[PDB]
Amino acid sequence: ATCYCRTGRCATRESLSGVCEISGRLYRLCCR
């Protein structure tokens, strides 16, 4: 798809699809 690692929630049009592991912290993987 088209995915982004986000600090906040996914966009309403995106689906939570996993997590990213960036410098010791997890971020939401958000995809449309």
UniProtKB/Swiss-Prot annotation:
Annotated effect of mutating R28A: Does not disrupt homodimer-formation. Reduced enhancement of S.flexneri infection. Impairs antimicrobial activity against E.coli, E.aerogenes, S.aureus and B.cereus. Reduced induction of IL-8 secretion
Substitution effect: R13A: Impairs antimicrobial activity against E.coli, E.aerogenes, S.aureus and B.cereus. Reduced induction of IL-8 secretion
Disulphide bonds in the chain: C3-C31, C5-C20, C10-C30
Impact when changing L26A: Reduced interaction with B.antracis lef/lethal factor. Reduced enhancement of S.flexneri infection
Effect caused by changing R32A: Impairs antimicrobial activity against E.coli, E.aerogenes, S.aureus and B.cereus. Reduced induction of IL-8 secretion
Name the UniProt record assigns to this protein: HD5(63-94)
